[PDB]
């Protein structure tokens, strides 16, 4: 099969700037049968370019496509706010029909450090037999942030899950929620609960901690 490699994985640019997305096939695409689709979070893909160079019906002029046999490019001459999304390339000249792995075109802004907040387990939760400790990283850029949990200064592993919001419409920042789950027994077995956050905006790793029971 024809594998399609999209580069870069993430393309960070400003609105009004030009976007240039690569699609390379592991072998020549028959009849230059390469399509480009846009996918916005929640939505279904939307055909932009067909046959490497032909602009789909209803597609604006800023979207164009070039590419011979093995190398193909999607150009967005001027990014509009609605142009920030994921872009998949696809070949349909030889079976199986394949897709590239997508290029996320996100809004580049200046570096913004996260404001970190730690939430101890509620009393009502503790009654159930499980304790959840929530660390929130608010309004930060770029998306890249490392959240480590330390329970009595011991580096945790495999007991936390992480979640990120989609780039904000207004300030172009991200927010993250991290949940460290523990049994009611192990929560009551320790005192210090600290979430350690590492980001480009932070000159030094920030630590937001509390002592179990202590306000």
């Amino acid at each position: 099969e024809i594998v399609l490699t999209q580069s870069p994985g993430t393309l960070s640019l400003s609105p009004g700037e030009r976007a240039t997305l690569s699609c390379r096939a592991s072998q020549s695409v028959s009849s230059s049968y390469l399509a480009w689709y846009q996918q916005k979070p929640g939505q279904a893909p939307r055909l932009l370019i067909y046959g490497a160079s032909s602009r789909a019906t209803g597609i604006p002029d800023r979207f164009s496509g070039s590419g011979s046999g093995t190398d193909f490019t999607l150009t967005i001459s001027r990014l509009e706010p609605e142009d920030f999304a994921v872009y998949y390339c696809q070949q349909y000249g030889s079976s199986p029909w394949t897709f590239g792995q997508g290029t996320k075109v996100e809004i580049k802004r200046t570096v913004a450090a996260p404001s970190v907040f730690i939430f101890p387990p509620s009393d009502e939760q503790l009654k159930s037999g499980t304790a959840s400790v929530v660390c929130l990283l608010n309004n930060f850029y770029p998306r890249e942030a490392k959240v480590q949990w330390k329970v009595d200064n011991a580096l945790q592993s495999g007991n936390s899950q992480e979640s990120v919001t989609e780039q904000d419409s207004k300030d172009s920042t991200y927010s993250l929620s991290s949940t460290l789950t523990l049994s009611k027994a192990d929560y009551e077995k320790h005192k210090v609960y600290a979430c350690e956050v590492t980001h480009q905006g932070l000159s030094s790793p920030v630590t937001k901690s509390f002592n179990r029971g202590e306000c």
């Binding site: 279904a44 046959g51 404001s115």
Partner: protein
Amino acid sequence: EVQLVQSGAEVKKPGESLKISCKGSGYSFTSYWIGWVRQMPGKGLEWMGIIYPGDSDTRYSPSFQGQVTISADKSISTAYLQWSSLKASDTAMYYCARVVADREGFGYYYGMDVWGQGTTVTVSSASTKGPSVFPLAPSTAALGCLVKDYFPEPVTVSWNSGALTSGVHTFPAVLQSSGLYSLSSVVTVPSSSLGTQTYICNVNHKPSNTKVDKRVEP
């Protein structure tokens, strides 16, 4: 209008059989091929195969051959995707798309132009369960709600019955090892407005007909 309309969200247990549908409107459905695309949670697009409904000529990806069945009822402009035994790995979004080709049988192709809205398929051992809503008490100040252990997705989360929208962050859910989902809805408000303003999260989970209006006080 040229449309492709798919069936509603499906929640099944492993081993169960499933037939999801896709209906075409506003065009001759037996004159085009229709493609099936799988998109796994947080992943890219995967071509499953195509059906020409005019004669039920099917073509699978080697990755889907023997895993799923693609079919069509040409009388009702409808194409289907069927699993005789669903796996947990079948959990994903499924799209149907119209393959543009010439009506003259010359073998010209023009990509997939019309897509369905998608059908969410969830395969898990878990049975329907309502969320347990917990406050993330404030200590500017941040506060919120932890919406823990529910199945299936989704839960809806509002604040103050829709009054509080500014700075409200409702995070994507996380699938726990227990098979039950968890998410956080947070809201950053000014430290001075805490004592006088009421902070209530409105959690709704249609699957278990669970409605929760939890107060977040310090």
